[PDB]
Amino acid sequence: LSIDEYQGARKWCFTIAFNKALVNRDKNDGLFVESLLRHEKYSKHDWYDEDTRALIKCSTQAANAKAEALANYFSAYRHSPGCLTFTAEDELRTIMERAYERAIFECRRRETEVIIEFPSLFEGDRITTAGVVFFVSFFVERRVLDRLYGAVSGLKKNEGQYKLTRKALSMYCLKDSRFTKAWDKRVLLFRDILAQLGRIPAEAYEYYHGEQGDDNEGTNPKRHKDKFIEFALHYLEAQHSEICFGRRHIVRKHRTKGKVVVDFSKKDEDQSYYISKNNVIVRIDKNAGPRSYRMGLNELKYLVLLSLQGKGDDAIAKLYRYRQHVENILDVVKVTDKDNHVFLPRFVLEQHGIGRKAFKQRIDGRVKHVRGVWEKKKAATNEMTLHEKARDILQYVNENCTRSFNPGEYNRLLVCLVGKDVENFQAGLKRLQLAERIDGRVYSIFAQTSTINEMHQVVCDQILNRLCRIGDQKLYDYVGLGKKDEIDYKQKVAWFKEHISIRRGFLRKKFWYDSKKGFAKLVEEHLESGGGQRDVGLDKKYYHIDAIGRFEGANPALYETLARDRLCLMMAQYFLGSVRKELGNKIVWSNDSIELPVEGSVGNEKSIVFSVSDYGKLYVLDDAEFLGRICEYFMPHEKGKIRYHTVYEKGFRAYNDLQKKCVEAVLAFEEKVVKAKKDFREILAQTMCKEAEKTAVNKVARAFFAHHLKFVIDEFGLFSDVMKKYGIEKEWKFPVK
RNA sequence: GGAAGAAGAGUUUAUUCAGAUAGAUUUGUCCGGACAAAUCUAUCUGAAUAAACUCUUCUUCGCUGGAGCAGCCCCCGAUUUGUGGGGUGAUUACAGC
């Protein structure tokens, strides 16, 4: 349809389409892959062949150059004549044919019409408008593609074949609706954190909804375990760069047996952190060299809280200093003061003579503790599990035996005891008695008993009797105070220097010195003031018990579980608000919404409102200051909180209607001035207008070209009058619109 | 009616997503017309993360010496997890039979 003849001002609608394609490419380069993989990525089956899939995956970043080249040719009448023609040798021409064939086959699966072939062929090296619209189908949304499919293109003419042509070209296009990116890591963290935070604590579930006898996870779940540490470590890694915690892996007498090794490699996703009784290992790498420490939960929660206030990084610096200070103390142990005294462990201080304890007090402390443990075990006979009882009974036999039991023999005896086959135990005792490994007294005392409870009671009686016997050196041997020390001091000091740990409560004294408030008050004040502006979904019924006294009962536990849980809430926000880099810092959270405030008047009413799903990067979303500008210049009357859909449906239409009429006029002016005269603002430079006015007109043109507006108000009037000078005038009602 | 760890097989519970099917509202295109987007309300498939519950296979379950600056427990107080004072015959970033 005179595709080559179509030139000059008669064809300008492609210009804005390619300008939009450029800004879409700037937002995301992967849109090409997404459009090519629309039906396969989130679905079970792929109609693409393996070779076609390999071609699509390998073909990346080359197509955008071709798109940019075509945009330049369509943009200007002056230059770039040979861009349109392309060789059939190109692989892009192969993948286009494959995709078009698959799409037309899918449309033919609709068996309504097969009579007429849909035209999409490119004649030899040249490409028709069908090829151009098919190519620009990628990188754009549905509505712009429909507008370009309008009467501007000659294909729009309605026939019986028209509907199938509309479907085939639009097959690989993406709707301007959300199409939210959902497989990102941060979103999958946020959803699970919220879901787990919506669960009943165990202790409160035991009573409030507690049943006299006890569905399960069915209706109102119970959180069996707490996962505060896993989320806190993820947040700490995400926020800062230096910190990377240790991780554990498994790979492969007591020789060459597989033993877990703590390593700091981040290559494998399967690696899980190393937490054993609420201890972690941290790495601080900066400046001269790496360093490391181990920390408890108490110093972890304070740092996690400190980061959110915005002072976190400085705190990390203090950790870097800590080790050095300890070194100084090791030189001045005798000289230094009490504050440095609390830093060093016991054995270091004991050598200098400080903290020595009398032997008799040690004996008295040890013996009563051991006797209390053993008398508790006596009352706990039936309650304990078989695993504990078997070890308890075997301990007496192994202690009585003169020769240390072989590790291999231990397992079979443990299996025999746990199997309730006490006869095998008796047989083993008889076998060991003959060689005299074990005393015959144990065999005599064990023979009568027939149940594990009876044997446990017998053993407890013997242990209590032997503890009851008068003081002797055998008592010291049995309690373990008799052992001597044969290791030099220097090796122990070297080991201690190799392995250091942080004092408990170190962070709290440094900054919150004057504070009288506890943990909960400190969390709650920042939650109310800094802008959490939310509370956990659970009612205060579960987190407190009214009947029992406040201090009495299990209430001291739950009152803390709330105080930490609030912190978790804030962390979840950081995993969603950080999706966008440009905005997301000015964003303010409020009651399950996300609001972006625009000052405007001194009274703030120009705020815009997103939902959680809307903030997920739909194609409609953009940068920050452009929103304020489009609100200022267009639709001034509306005030108050505005749903983003209203701005989307109002401002963008006015912007497009203005821009099309502006660009067509400027192109016509360029053509006319080029004809009258007989790139890079050469015409505007030729104009007798002032250089400031040249800058104004080219700035106004390039602003509408780049889809962002930053020009001042006065420039548009100058552009209007200079355009009027050439004799072509049209009114767009831009100001006070 | 043994305990932890690993590999594997599943099972069902609650939130998200993609492609399709209807209803209302609303906007803009064409010579009253269909169409094109959107926001809510129901329908059908499929996919991913999390929690719990079964089954199969395997692996380890000892003794000696140093460490309690870290993790646990009792006194003493408290809108509560405290650089207030006393224990823990060791839980291990470890070394030897």
Residue numbers in the entry: 14 to 227, 233 to 270, 281 to 706, 717 to 775
Which passages does the manuscript contain on this structure?
The CRISPR-Cas13 system is an RNA-guided ribonuclease with a single Cas13 protein effector and a CRISPR RNA (crRNA). Upon proper target RNA binding and pairing with the spacer segment of the crRNA, the Higher Eukaryotes and Prokaryotes Nucleotide-binding (HEPN) nuclease domains within Cas13 are activated to cleave the bound RNA in cis (on-target cleavage activity) and any surrounding non-specific single-strand RNA (ssRNA) in trans (collateral activity). Herein, we report detailed biochemical and structural characterizations of a compact Cas13 (Cas13bt3) suitable for adeno-associated virus delivery. Distinct from many other Cas13 systems, Cas13bt3 cleaves the target and other nonspecific RNA at internal “UC” sites and is activated in a target length-dependent manner.
To understand the structural basis of Cas13bt3 activation, we attempted to capture Cas13bt3 in a fully activated state with the catalytically inactive Cas13bt3 (dCas13bt3, R84A/H89A/R739A/H744A), crRNA and a 30 nt target. To stabilize the ternary complex, we designed a hairpin substrate by connecting the crRNA and target RNA with a 6 nt (CUUCUU) linker to stabilize the ternary complex. 3D auto refinement yielded a final map at 3.5 Å, with the core of the complex approaching 3 Å. The structure of Cas13bt3-hpRNA ternary complex with the 30 bp duplex (from here on characterized as Cas13bt3Act, the true active state according to our biochemical assays,) appears as a bilobed architecture with recognition (REC) and nuclease (NUC) lobes on two ends of the spacer/target duplex RNA (dsRNA). In contrast to previous LbuCas13a20 and EsCas13d21 structures, there is no direct contact between the REC and NUC lobes in Cas13bt3. Instead, the REC and NUC lobes are connected by two IDLs (inter-domain linkers): IDL1 (residues 183-215) is between the HEPN1 and Helical1 domains, interacting with the spacer/target duplex; IDL2 (residues 607-614) locates near the HEPN active site and bridges Helical1 and HEPN2 domains. With the REC lobe aligned, the mass center of the NUC lobe in Cas13bt3Act moves ~40 Å and 20 Å and rotates 34 and 19 degrees relative to those in Cas13btBin and Cas13btInt, respectively. Besides the rigid-body movement of HEPN domains, there are drastic conformational changes in IDL1 and IDL2. First, the IDL1 loop is dragged away from the REC lobe by HEPN1 movement to form new contacts with the spacer/target RNA duplex (discussed below). Second, the IDL2 loop undergoes large-scale structural transition relative to that in Cas13bt3Bin and Cas13bt3Int towards the HEPN active site, allowing the HEPN2 domain to move as a rigid body together with the HEPN1 domain. Patch1 was only formed upon the long target RNA binding, and the R608, K609, K194, and K645 in Patch1 translocated 5.6, 4.7, 11 and 15 Å compared to corresponding residues in Cas13bt3Int.
